Structure formats: structure tokens, C-alpha cells
Amino acid sequence: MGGSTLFVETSLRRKDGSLEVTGQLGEVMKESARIAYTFARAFLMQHAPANDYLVTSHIHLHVPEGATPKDGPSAGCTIVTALLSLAMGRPVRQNLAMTGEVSLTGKILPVGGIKEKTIAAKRAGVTCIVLPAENKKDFYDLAAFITEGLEVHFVEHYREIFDIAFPD
Amino acid sequence: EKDDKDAIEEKFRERLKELVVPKHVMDVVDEELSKLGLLDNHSSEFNVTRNYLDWLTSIPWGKYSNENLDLARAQAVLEEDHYGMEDVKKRILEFIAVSQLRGSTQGKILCFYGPPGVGKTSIARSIARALNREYFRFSVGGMTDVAEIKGHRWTYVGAMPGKIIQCLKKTKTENPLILIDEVDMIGRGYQGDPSSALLELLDPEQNANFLDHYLDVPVDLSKVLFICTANVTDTIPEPLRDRMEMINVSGYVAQEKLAIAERYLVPQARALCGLDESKAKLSSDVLTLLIKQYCRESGVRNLQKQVEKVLRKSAYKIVSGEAESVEVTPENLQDFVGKPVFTVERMYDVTPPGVVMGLAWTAMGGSTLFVETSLRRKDGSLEVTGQLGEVMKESARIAYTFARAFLMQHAPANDYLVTSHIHLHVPEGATPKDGPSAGCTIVTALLSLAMGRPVRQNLAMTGEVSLTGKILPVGGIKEKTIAAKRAGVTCIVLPAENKKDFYDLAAFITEGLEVHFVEHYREIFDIAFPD
Amino acid sequence: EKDDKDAIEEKFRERLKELVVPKHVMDVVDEELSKLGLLDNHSSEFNVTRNYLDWLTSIPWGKYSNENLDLARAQAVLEEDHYGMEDVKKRILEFIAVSQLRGSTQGKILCFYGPPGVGKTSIARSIARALNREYFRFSVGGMTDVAEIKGHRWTYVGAMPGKIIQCLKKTKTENPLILIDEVDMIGRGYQGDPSSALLELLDPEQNANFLDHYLDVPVDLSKVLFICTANVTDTIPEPLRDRMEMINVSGYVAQEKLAIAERYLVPQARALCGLDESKAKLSSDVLTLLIKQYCRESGVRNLQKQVEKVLRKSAYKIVSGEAESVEVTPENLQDFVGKPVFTVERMYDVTPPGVVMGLAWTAMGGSTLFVETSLRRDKDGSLEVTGQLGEVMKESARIAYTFARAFLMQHAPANDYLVTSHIHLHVPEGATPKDGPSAGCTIVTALLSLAMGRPVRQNLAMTGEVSLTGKILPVGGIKEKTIAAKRAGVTCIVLPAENKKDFYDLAAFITEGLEVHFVEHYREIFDIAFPD
Numbered sequence A: 001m002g003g004s005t006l007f008v009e010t011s012l013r014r015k016d017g018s019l020e021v022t023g024q025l026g027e028v029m030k031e032s033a034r035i036a037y038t039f040a041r042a043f044l045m046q047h048a049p050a051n052d053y054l055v056t057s058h059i060h061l062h063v064p065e066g067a068t069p070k071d072g073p074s075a076g077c078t079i080v081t082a083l084l085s086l087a088m089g090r091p092v093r094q095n096l097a098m099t100g101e102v103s104l105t106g107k108i109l110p111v112g113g114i115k116e117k118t119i120a121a122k123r124a125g126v127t128c129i130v131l132p133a134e135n136k137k138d139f140y141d142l143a144a145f146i147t148e149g150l151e152v153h154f155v156e157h158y159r160e161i162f163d164i165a166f167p168d
Numbered sequence B: 001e002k003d004d005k006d007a008i009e010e011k012f013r014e015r016l017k018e019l020v021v022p023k024h025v026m027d028v029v030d031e032e033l034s035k036l037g038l039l040d041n042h043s044s045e046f047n048v049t050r051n052y053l054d055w056l057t058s059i060p061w062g063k064y065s066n067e068n069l070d071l072a073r074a075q076a077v078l079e080e081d082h083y084g085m086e087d088v089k090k091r092i093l094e095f096i097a098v099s100q101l102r103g104s105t106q107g108k109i110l111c112f113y114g115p116p117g118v119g120k121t122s123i124a125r126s127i128a129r130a131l132n133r134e135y136f137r138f139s140v141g142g143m144t145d146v147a148e149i150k151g152h153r154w155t156y157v158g159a160m161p162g163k164i165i166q167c168l169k170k171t172k173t174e175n176p177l178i179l180i181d182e183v184d185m186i187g188r189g190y191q192g193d194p195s196s197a198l199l200e201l202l203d204p205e206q207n208a209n210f211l212d213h214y215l216d217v218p219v220d221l222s223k224v225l226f227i228c229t230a231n232v233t234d235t236i237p238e239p240l241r242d243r244m245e246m247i248n249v250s251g252y253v254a255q256e257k258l259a260i261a262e263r264y265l266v267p268q269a270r271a272l273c274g275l276d277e278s279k280a281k282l283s284s285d286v287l288t289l290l291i292k293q294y295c296r297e298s299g300v301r302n303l304q305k306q307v308e309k310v311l312r313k314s315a316y317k318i319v320s321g322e323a324e325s326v327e328v329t330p331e332n333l334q335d336f337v338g339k340p341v342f343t344v345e346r347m348y349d350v351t352p353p354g355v356v357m358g359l360a361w362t363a364m365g366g367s368t369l370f371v372e373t374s375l376r377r378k379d380g381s382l383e384v385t386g387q388l389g390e391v392m393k394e395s396a397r398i399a400y401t402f403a404r405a406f407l408m409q410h411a412p413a414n415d416y417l418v419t420s421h422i423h424l425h426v427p428e429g430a431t432p433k434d435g436p437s438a439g440c441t442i443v444t445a446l447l448s449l450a451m452g453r454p455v456r457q458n459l460a461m462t463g464e465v466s467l468t469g470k471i472l473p474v475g476g477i478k479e480k481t482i483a484a485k486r487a488g489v490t491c492i493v494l495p496a497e498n499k500k501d502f503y504d505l506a507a508f509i510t511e512g513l514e515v516h517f518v519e520h521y522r523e524i525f526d527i528a529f530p531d
Numbered sequence C: 001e002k003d004d005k006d007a008i009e010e011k012f013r014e015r016l017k018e019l020v021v022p023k024h025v026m027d028v029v030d031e032e033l034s035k036l037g038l039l040d041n042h043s044s045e046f047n048v049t050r051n052y053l054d055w056l057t058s059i060p061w062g063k064y065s066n067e068n069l070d071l072a073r074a075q076a077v078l079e080e081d082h083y084g085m086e087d088v089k090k091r092i093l094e095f096i097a098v099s100q101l102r103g104s105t106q107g108k109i110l111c112f113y114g115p116p117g118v119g120k121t122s123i124a125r126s127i128a129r130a131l132n133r134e135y136f137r138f139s140v141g142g143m144t145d146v147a148e149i150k151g152h153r154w155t156y157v158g159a160m161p162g163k164i165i166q167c168l169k170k171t172k173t174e175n176p177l178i179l180i181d182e183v184d185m186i187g188r189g190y191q192g193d194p195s196s197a198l199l200e201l202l203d204p205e206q207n208a209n210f211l212d213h214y215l216d217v218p219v220d221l222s223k224v225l226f227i228c229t230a231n232v233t234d235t236i237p238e239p240l241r242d243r244m245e246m247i248n249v250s251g252y253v254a255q256e257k258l259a260i261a262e263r264y265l266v267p268q269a270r271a272l273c274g275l276d277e278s279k280a281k282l283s284s285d286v287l288t289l290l291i292k293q294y295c296r297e298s299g300v301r302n303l304q305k306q307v308e309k310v311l312r313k314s315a316y317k318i319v320s321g322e323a324e325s326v327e328v329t330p331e332n333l334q335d336f337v338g339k340p341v342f343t344v345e346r347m348y349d350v351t352p353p354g355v356v357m358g359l360a361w362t363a364m365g366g367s368t369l370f371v372e373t374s375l376r377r378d379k380d381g382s383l384e385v386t387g388q389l390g391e392v393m394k395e396s397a398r399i400a401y402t403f404a405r406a407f408l409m410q411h412a413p414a415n416d417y418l419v420t421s422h423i424h425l426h427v428p429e430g431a432t433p434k435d436g437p438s439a440g441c442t443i444v445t446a447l448l449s450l451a452m453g454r455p456v457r458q459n460l461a462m463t464g465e466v467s468l469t470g471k472i473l474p475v476g477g478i479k480e481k482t483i484a485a486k487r488a489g490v491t492c493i494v495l496p497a498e499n500k501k502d503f504y505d506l507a508a509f510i511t512e513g514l515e516v517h518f519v520e521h522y523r524e525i526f527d528i529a530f531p532d
């Protein structure tokens, strides 16, 4: 029907530790989440080795149904951010939207439908969008109206998004 | 095949004359009718096409019966259909008031929970009768397939559309009253959670473009008054629980059931058998005795059967000339119903040490049970039983932890929960939410065992106990004390906050029960063991 | 063709003339028939229309089997058909009385449950004839198809109605007796559950107006007498069971079976064989012998076969001219069935230490079984359990074990045996989930027997759940238990005090020979099962 904005929620359900995934029960969603889950853990263990929140807990995760097969990967980093948000216990720098597939070592990967996704962002009135470096060409080539009044950063690795999304 | 194509087309136009389809459906209707002219009446597709067109045209598109309504008239309907349900009548008139104000259906949808046979479906029938509104009911209890809701595509052998589409068709209206019963007993579908389908139906904005697998036309569903029923509140999924305006339909006491019986049940049964009102004389005392010793249902359905049996037994005597006239007395009731079934009300009249009363609500409404403990012989450890949840265990863990520390405060020289391995038992059935409510009871149970004293005779209590000894408030106070009144337990201890619920109860419920409200557990010990 | 369209119409009317249709139905048929009178004959649509009209006109609307009921007359029919079943016969009398008082036909829903071979199916046949009502039998069974009842859409290619409409066509009354079989074993899966469909069949409200995919008109089924058959009541779907009127049918003991045999079984096998009493003869002792040592079930299902077998054997003998009359006696029965199959029934005629006798309710009927224990050798001891034990069983048995420990140490502190050692316990299968914890108290008796080195009191059968404190709690299926204890050679039985109601509701001769204890606490059982 067109480009849309989708919300990502993480919740605590309370050795062992697991992630429980809900929403569309497509396999591709599950594997992408697993990747995201493990990277988040990996990121945490080096950034804040003291904390073991994600390590020692069962976490429930939900994603809305409005996604094509390719959109599954597209929401990779968002999960990670949410997990780190739950772990650090702090919400993001306010009014920040984002779309990107994340490698297991954390490098960001290209996503489809930048044109349609940006429309929803402007519609929802977000201050900032951060996108993969390889998606750079598509945004500049869009219509005029959507460009002005949007802060954009291009990212290659999730380390970058961490600093942007969380100032300190 | 001569006049076959023309007549079929024309009769559909007659149907479309009254039930005019939306403006975007002209093309779909015309296309099907035109290609019907193309298909020979011998072809397989022709027969299927005729069904599809018949189903489509049969839907009352943009056609709705009139609604004349009044809030004061509704109360008269409510009063005459059922006795009691003071809170229930209040709750439903609120929605009627809100609906009258707006003159259209609310975004929020209505559901009722309570014991089976309480009259949840009866309320739905009464509301329809109150609104002068057409009624239909379809069940979602035990379903697992979304295709049950959306039907199947026409190529299926004996093609059958969505149930929602059916009920709209039969009612011949755009604004029917639909009862979606047993929403709680919904199945978690393997191919996809029917939660998605349910949320489509609940949201009026989403209902405007509802799609099925059969019609392939966006149904402009709105102003349909969805009414739902449930038994317990837990089994409903999280997105559906908060999306639903919820009403508690509580149980009844002896006097309450009797008035139901005298006004409704006896006339219903007399009418069903066509009996003479003089020849089948039924005393009020009999029904009280029947209630106390022949039934354990919070509802009226089990009671209704026993009542039917009474009148049924009488009918045989009358025809056969066994008995000239039937005079139902407690003395001769044995012939009509047989021997008393529950001469035992509550077991443990003398409550032994390590036993404490327990309260909660269940699927069947108000429930009673007991907590039990014993020994089994440097360290000490706890064994728990029942088919208990993980949360239940942790509640006990809290309870066990506190008990040790509490025993220290009262009697330091004791070491009973310290150097002893104890078995604990908790009966199951109760809702997970209200499950930790036996927490404090458990503490009393463990402590009772400590010095070897029985808890103060005929003593009942419930409520969640925290780490600091704080007594947390619990829901469904009406249900718990109903059971307590059944039990004939005189003293009840309850949480402080829930004092609001107790004073919200009607006069009958509150009769002769010395209740006290408490905030810390040390307060209950003051009652439980002053000596 | 033009005048022949007319000719077909009145052929449909004459089928409908004495079958007075409802008002809504009249309108539906008028629309369809006038359609049929214009549509060309060669068209397949015409055939579909005709087929739909065929079934609609074939339904006997406003036609009833006018029940020429007489209360004593009907009673005699029931007696001349079956033995026993006093409770059920009374219930049927009540139905007759109800219909008489109204002076018009009425339909009720009645369910029969119990062990197989109790004649519930045959009672069905007997009721139909007694009432002068058309009979039909149907079996939902394990099928998961809704369309079996609801049928298919009429306008769809190769349309067929459900069994409910099918049988209503052959039977020429609005109010037949329909038998529904194996309501307990209704399945669920791909297409759905028939329980959803038949919910419309066993609901008084939905009975007044019933809809199918075939005939597509609201019809009256509130006049239809629905009889359902099941084996155990627990597994029946909650909504259907709770709304349903439930009648318990019991099995039979020696005397009862014997009565059935002489009165009914033997004459029935003679009819099948074409034999007469003048050529084949059977004494009571023979059938007593045949009942004792050739059958095990509480029903008489096996017994019919054994009798059928003997008479069948005798038929051949008659023709051949080996002996011109056959009289079966304990002397010559060995020729007909061979040596006795079940010579012994108590697989422990004396019960050794740590064995108890329990009684259990099973789908096939009342069954005895034995619970056995074994030993497998400061530290804590253990219990290991075996059998097809559910989650319920595991929990209840732990409680048994817990009460065991405390009971013994409180009663006798010197005997540290049970607590300090490892015990195996085995509980035999066949016990239904609900009847499962009924042998709780026996389990506890088992352990204590094992503990002191005391064998149990001979010929003692028991049942009853035990709480942690040792409160004996009431149990179900008492009727079946007692019948089983009778055959099992039991002399003493021990029950819950709350169950005293159930015990005395039995006929006198059944309860006879058995000393009965009602108990409330376990200290009592302990004294009963160990006198000294």
C-alpha cells in the first residue's frame, strides 16, 4: 500500500538466557533476530563488560506485521538499538528513526525501498534519519520537499549508530 | 439455454434493487453477470459463478433496520429479563448512555467474564431485545483456523464464505448485534495467530475494508454491535485484552438464586412441560434446601436441571394416577430428586496444625481450598506440590523467606523452618493472576507448624504478601467472600486497600461476617495467634 | 417442452400437498419452482434446481408419527426387551408422561454412557418401537468433517446434504428418534470439529431454527428425540456435555448377566441359527460356568459370542446326525468352547507384603488392579514411580509418599525404614485421568505394609484420595467399582464417608456379601487393613 513506520518493543519476561520473538512467525524474521540478539550481546560485552542484563535474562520482542520478506533484514539494527536501550535502561535521543540490516560483526548492509520509507519518516515528522553508506545515492535523488529539515548520517558499522542514538 | 441466462441476471437485479452495493462494486457485479452470459450453463464454472453472485447480492449492502431506543426503557427490559446484577446493569447502561450520546458504535468493544451458567449470553439476548435489535451468535471457542473466519475461495468443494458475512446476510441488516462467544478459549493458530483476524473485527476503521477469501470485495462493515463473552481473563492475548472493555458478571447467593427460581425458573419449567400451577405446587423452602445440599454451581444451569427433574417427576404421577396432586415437601422430596449430594459443605471443621484456609476465583467462579504442610525427617529445604506455575513457586519462595525472618522476630530461640525439610501443598484451579494471593496463607501455614498450634478455629484469609510483610490488594473480592459465605466461615481477614470492594457489596453478602482490613502480616498474626 | 414444464410442477406439488410447509419455506419453494417452470430442461442449472426442489418437497413437513402412547403399554414393551435399567425406564416414562400432558409431540435430548455391551444401542431400538416413532442410527465417531452434518451448497456442482437431512428424508416424520454414536471420541483437525456443527443439534434454542448448506432454510428439530452414546463422560466437549441431559448406565453382575442370558441371549441366538428349544438345551449352571470363566467385561458383549458359538456348533451337529438332540452341560461343554479360559481372577490369591488391591474406573468398565512396591538397596531416601502416569499422578503419588513418611514416624518413631531407603512403586494402567488419584490411599497402605513387614488383610479392595494431612476425600465411579470387587472375590471394601450416599443407591443383592467401611481419616483405614 506504500511506505510505513513500524514500532519495535522489547520487554523483560521476569545459568540461562534466551530471546522470545513474536509477531509474524516467518523463519527469516527469526534468524535475523537471532543474529541481532547475538551481536547485541557481543556489543555489550566489550562496551559494558560489567553489565550482564541481556546475558542472564529472558526478553520478549514484538514486531508489527507490515513487512515484506526483504523488510525482515531491513529492521536489523532497530532490534539491536532496542536491546541496548533495554539493557542501558535509557530511551534513544528523542525523535530518531532508522532502517538497516546488521551483520553479525556489526557492519551495516543495504536495504530496499528507501524512496517509500523516507516518505513515512517525513509524514511521522522525524528529526533525523541514519542510513547505510551504500544507500547514499538514492536519498539525494529523491523529490525536493522531503530533503530539507531532515538530519541525515551515513553509517557503515553499528558503533556509529550507538554514539548517535545515545549521546553518552 | 433459452431464458436461463436472462432470468438469473434479472433476479439478481431485483436483489440489487433493495440491497445496493457500494459504488466501486458496480464493475465486479457487472463483470460476473456478463461472463455468466459467456459461460454455458453446462460448464462447471457457471454453477460456481451463480453461487458467488447469489452470495454477493444476498448481503444487505447499505441496508439497515431502524433503531428506536431509550436508556430508561432499557432498564425496564433489564429488570424484567433478570433479577439482581446491580453492578452488571450499571456497567452496561454506561455503554448504552455513551452510545446514545454519539448515536454510533464506539471504537471500544464489550466483553463479559464470569462462572458458566451465570447468564452472560442471556445479557446479550436482553440487550438485543432492549435495543429492538436483531441478534445472531457465532462461536470462536476452540477454533484454530483463521480460514474458519475468512471462509474459503470458491474453487473449494462446497465453497463456504466467512461466518461474519453469513450473519450479516441472515439478519438482512448493516447494523446487527453479534455475540462472539468464548473469545477466551481462542486457539493460538499454527499457520498464524487469529489475533490478527480478531483485531480486524474489533477496529471499526479496519472493518470498512474487511476482506475474506471468498467474496474478494471490501465489506464496508461498521455500526455492528460486537458483544463477546469469556470465562477467565488470562487466556485472551495481550493485544486483545487491552482492546476490550471488560465487565465482571459475578455469582449469586442462596436468597438471590431463589428469587431467580421463583420468578423465572419455575414459570419457564412449568411452561416447558405445560403443567398446572396448582397441581405441581412448589415450596420455597425446598429450593433453599436444594440449593444448600444438592448444588455447588455458582450459576443456575445445574440448578435448573434439578428443578426440571422435580417438575418432571410430578408429571408422571399426575397422568398415571399414582398421586392425585403433587405437594413438594422436604420430607417427600427424596422421591423426586433422590438423596442429598453435598451434605458436607466444607471439610476440616477442626483445622489441624499446618493447615490454613485459602480463597480465590476460578473458571467456575468463587472457590475454596486449603494449604497443607508437613515434615519429612545442618540445613533446611522446601518441597512444593500442586500443578503450580513458575510464578507460584516464587510466591512461595517469598513466603518461605519471610516466614524464617518472621519466626526470628517472634521467637528467636526457635529454629523450626531452619533445621527442617518441609513439604508444602497448594491446590490448583485458580487463575495465575490471583494465584500469589495464597501467599500469606502459606506463611501462616509454615508458622502454624512451627510451634504446633492450630490456626484460630474457622479462620479464613487471603492476599498477596510482599517481602516487607505488606499485604497487596487482590481482585474479585465478591467471588471470594461468596465462597466464604458458602463455607460458613465467620472471620475473614483481607487486604486494607480492598476495603473499597467490601463496602461496594450488597447487604446479603456482608451479613454476619466479622471482616478486618490489614496492611502488614504482623496484623494478621494478632488475630491468627494472639495465643 | 413448454407444457412439460407445467407437468413437472404439480408432481412436486402433490409431494407437498399433504406435507404442509412453513411460511418462509413456502416462499423459497415458490421462487424456485416458478424459476424451474421457465428455465430450459436441458440446462444443468435446471437439474440442480430440480435436485434442490426434490429434497425440499421430500421432507415430511407437518407430518408426525402420532404416538399412540399408553403408559403401561409402553412400560411392558421395555420390560419384554431388556432386563434391569430401572432408572432409565423411569426417565423414559417421564418423557411419555410429558408428551401426553402436552397432548402434542415434543423433543428432548438424552445421553447414555457407560461400559460397552450394556445394550444402550439395543435400548435405543426398543425406545423407538415403544413410542411408535421412526428409528435411525448415526455415528460421528473420530471424524473431523463438519460437512458430514452440514452438507454442501446446493447450487454447487455435485451437491449432497448432511446425514441429518438424509435420514429425515427416509423417515417420514418431523419427529424421528436419532441415535448418535461415540460422542466422546469426536475429533478435531484440518476442517474443524463436528462438535461445532452438532452444537446446533443439541441446543434447544438452535433446535427451533436449524440451517444447513443444502436446504438453506430454518427448520424445526425441537421435536426430534436425540439420543447420544458415550463410554466415559469426562472426554465429551465441555459445552455439549454441560448442556446435555446425562444418564449413567451401569454394567451387570453374575445374577444380572445370568438373567439376561436365559431370558434374552439364548432365544436371540436360536433365532439367528433357526434352532428351537426342542433340539438345543441350556441349563443355568452351564451359563453360570460360561459367565464365570469365559468373560471379564462388565457388559455382556463377550457372552453373546460364547452363546452364539455353542449354539452355532450345535447346529452343524444336528444336521450331521451325531446326536439328535444337544443338551449342553458342564460335562460336555468342553467340546463346544474348550477348557476354561479364565480359571483365576486374583493374580495374587494371597497378597504378599507391599502389594495392595485397588479398584479403578475404566472406559471398558469396572476393573480391579494391584499396586506393587519394591526396594532397591545421613542421607535422604527416594521414591521411583512407573506406569503410564500423567502429571497429576506424579504429584498425587508424591503426596501419598509424603503422607506415608509422616504417618509412620508419628505412629512409630523406631521404624525409620520408609524415609531412609529407596522404594519402587508401580501403579497399573487403565485408570482414567480423573479416577487416577482414587488409589492414593491404597498406595499409602502399600508403603506401610512394605515398611513394617506386614502383609495386608486378605480380600480387601479399596479406593479414595488422600490429602497431605490424611483426610480421605470422595471419589467417583463407585457403581462400577463394586461390581468389579464382586467378580474379583472381594469380601471387604473401604470407601470415603462422603460416598455413603452412592453405595446405598445400589440394589441390595449387588452390595450383598461385602463388608463396607466408610472412612474420613487414614488412621481408620490403617486399623481396618491391619487389624492387629
Ligand SMILES: Nc1ncnc2c1ncn2[C@@H]1O[C@H](COP(=O)(O)OP(=O)(O)O)[C@@H](O)[C@H]1O
Pocket: B081, B082, B083, B084, B085, B114, B115, B116, B117, B118, B119, B120, B121, B122, B123, B229, B260, B264, B299, B300
Ligand atoms: N440472574 C438471572 N435471572 C434470571 N435468569 C437468569 C439469571 N442468570 C441466568 N439466567 C438464566 O440463564 C439461562 C442461560 O444462561 P447463559 O446465558 O447460558 O449463562 P452463561 O452465559 O453464564 O453460560 C437463561 O435461560 C436465563 O433465564
Ligand SMILES: Nc1ncnc2c1ncn2[C@@H]1O[C@H](COP(=O)(O)OP(=O)(O)O)[C@@H](O)[C@H]1O
Pocket: C081, C082, C083, C084, C085, C115, C116, C117, C118, C119, C120, C121, C122, C123, C260, C264, C300, C301, C304
Ligand atoms: N440388560 C439387558 N437385558 C437384556 N439384553 C441385554 C441387556 N444388556 C445388554 N443386552 C444385550 O446385549 C447385546 C449387545 O448390546 P449392544 O447394544 O451391542 O451394546 P452397547 O450398549 O455397548 O452398544 C444386545 O443384543 C442386547 O440385547
